[PDB]
Amino acid sequence: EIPGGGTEGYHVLRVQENSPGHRAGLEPFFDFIVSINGSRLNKDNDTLKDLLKANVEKPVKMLIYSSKTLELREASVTPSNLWGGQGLLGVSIRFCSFDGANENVWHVLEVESNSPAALAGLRPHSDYIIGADTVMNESEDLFSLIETHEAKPLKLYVYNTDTDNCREVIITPNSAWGGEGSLGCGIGYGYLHRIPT
């Protein structure tokens, strides 16, 4: 149900709390803006910015694809400069495309007491690692990143199903932690280990 087709759109990467984007329920990392007021956003150009500007204090209708739910939804958003912060929406985006987006996640399984994972605040079963400050586009890439950060702090971005929020954690892999490996938690990857739909 995307008029115009294609998988291009604007990947929402930041949503400031209490912004018009936040009030509309835009979710960082998972949401892709695919149209605004029925205009398909399938090109990297100024259409989105200009339509927001033309509609300051006027509700607009966005069509959004979520890589969390794998569904399209419509959201009403009111661009405004009266909410206290900077920008009409209070979001940051990059032109992108949503096909494959839901696959690059790593499911936190059991977490051992006193492990590097425990210390970082990783939560068994409900946490999903969604990325880091370097590219990870294959199953083994989180494990490679962990290897390359032996005894070094590593920033991970993490979604939690219970709070339904994303956060940043810092983990320091450590092969001398006392138990197996450098992490001390299980990690799942693949169709059984994606964010519950």
Binding site: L13, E17, D44, K49, R94, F95, N104, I130, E168
Partner: peptide, 21 residues
Amino acid sequence: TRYENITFNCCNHCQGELIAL
């Protein structure tokens, strides 16, 4: 643990420049 106003710039498909709107 950081939780606020985070930019999750960790997508390998993103092509365009990072824009604040």
